[model samples]
Target: QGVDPPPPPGPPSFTGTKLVNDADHPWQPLREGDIRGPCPGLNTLASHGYLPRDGVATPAQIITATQEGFNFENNAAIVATYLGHLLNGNLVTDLLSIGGATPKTGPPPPPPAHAGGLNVHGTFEGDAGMTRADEFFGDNHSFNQTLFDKFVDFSNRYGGGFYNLTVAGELRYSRIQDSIATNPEFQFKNVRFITAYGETVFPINLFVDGRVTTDRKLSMEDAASIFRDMRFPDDFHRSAVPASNEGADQVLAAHPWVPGGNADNQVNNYVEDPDSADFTHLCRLYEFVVGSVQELYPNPTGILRRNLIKNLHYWWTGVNVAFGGCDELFPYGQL
Candidate 1:
């Protein structure tokens, strides 16, 4: 027998409007080895001690931390955590690195195993991030000032000086167009399509302290602290209501972006990829993810294989039961 994976974390004891309660969690500056990643939300959580300061955490820890820290909706938290963990986490140890690859994730699996962290592009992190640049420009994780300015511009021009859902839709479309015109390897489909919109409004939905009512319009100052500095506003409270990528559909519809990638490594060579997942075809997206997991660990052995099944079980269960689940996939045969 090998290591049995830990059970996934459940929703907290209290899931409602409450102060982030920094008195217990408390904000602390990162030490030399603390890791950060492409997700400003997760970064801020780590900084606040809602997550491990080192930036590596198990799926249980991540789900619990995100829900506790941001009141991230349960379904959204589960899907994101399981997928990121499956794609890039160290299955043996159940640890996922929020940033790039590191020895801190435990031990490497093997070449092509891709124990790289969430910062690795194409898995969870993708192009056209509001504050982060495309990987093609050489750095995808670090916050880019120029991109931040563009985000600010859109907030003012569209949302009347607040980064609301309207601003998110506009900026998201503009960033995609910008990447299309510039980054030769620009991509805007699959996970990228999903995260790009989700990332846009994370600041609006998850960053604002729940106490701030009104329309939940995020201020530029608070926006910078969240994206650029990965810090929460003072006296912050988790959202009064749990939210996920709830508003992403509106953002996607406001400016419809076809799923595709730049072909031939040439700028403006974008060719629509027919297989991409859209709101209409969420079931297909589920297929793509499960298939990828099976392909990645085709021949895992002993505990590794068992843990893979366990994680895959979590991933499948995360899907909406009404939409129906994909046919069970058992690379190692039925458990």
Candidate 2:
């Protein structure tokens, strides 16, 4: 429905990308010594030992990386903090998803025309969602050292966060290693870019939304495609604006953005409806994840992040797979 041309055909392959390993039938185990270790080291899971080693992950490795604290479900923005490594060969399942979970409903219409068109900039940088939300929305722009001391402490108490982070950081490294070992033509595009609109939000909303009594249990892939695709304005705000009086302009300015450039900068300074609740609940975190991954590169104009996300949607509708995992070798193309 977008004016842009359909995505060019993706990497040609027989029987589709051979996505699943034959014996594994889609859940192939990582090779014996192929651990995707942490970027720096493996010393930090919970406080107790059980520290990880490199090469094909241990049970501790896979289990922890997928750990997400239970929430009502839409609680996923926090779940996204897992560094997004693959489980089996697909996006990891929230093995611990709260009971009765349901997928987010649907994608927004394709983005409406905004003056920004193709030119946008700045990946607004911020902390992880849970921390960022606490600081910005509640803590008055500062850390609650006492609160965080325990907050972070509570998260770490079980070492689930640590283990999850550990495996993700490590596996992210490992998969890239495997790609290079086998395929000489590997490209390190962000898989999220190829993720369909439903794919992008469904898994997230599924894990985060906590209903506890759903009719259907979704496979990770089906869950990923659950929602159609989301549409938004060029500005990316999903709901109607509250009477745009100039009174709260200062508060609007408080939340920073990466800039949409001369063409799209207008929306960056408006205070959003804190009560819109539907999309807005996950909206901030949505931007944070997109913005977070987008900012990792040098896309000062916002073009990098924009295209990376677009391709994920476009390609996903076309291909069932994401580009592949990242690493030093497979740096995303946007930068």
Mark the regions of model 1 whose C-alpha exceeds 4 Å error after superposition. 321-325
Error of 1 at 261 (Å): 1.3
- Model 1 lDDT-worst window of ten: 320-329
What tens-digit string does per-residue lDDT give for candidate 2 at 250-312? 222333222111112231232233322122132333334344443343332243234444433
Model 1 per-residue lDDT tens digits across residues 272-301: 988987667777677787778777887787
TM-score, candidate number 2: 0.21
Count of clashes in candidate 2: 33
Instruction: Give the number of the best model, judged by lDDT.
Output: 1
Global lDDT scores for all candidate models: 0.83, 0.23
Listed in order, each prediction's TM-score against the native is: 0.96, 0.21
Among the numbered candidates, top TM-score falls to: 1
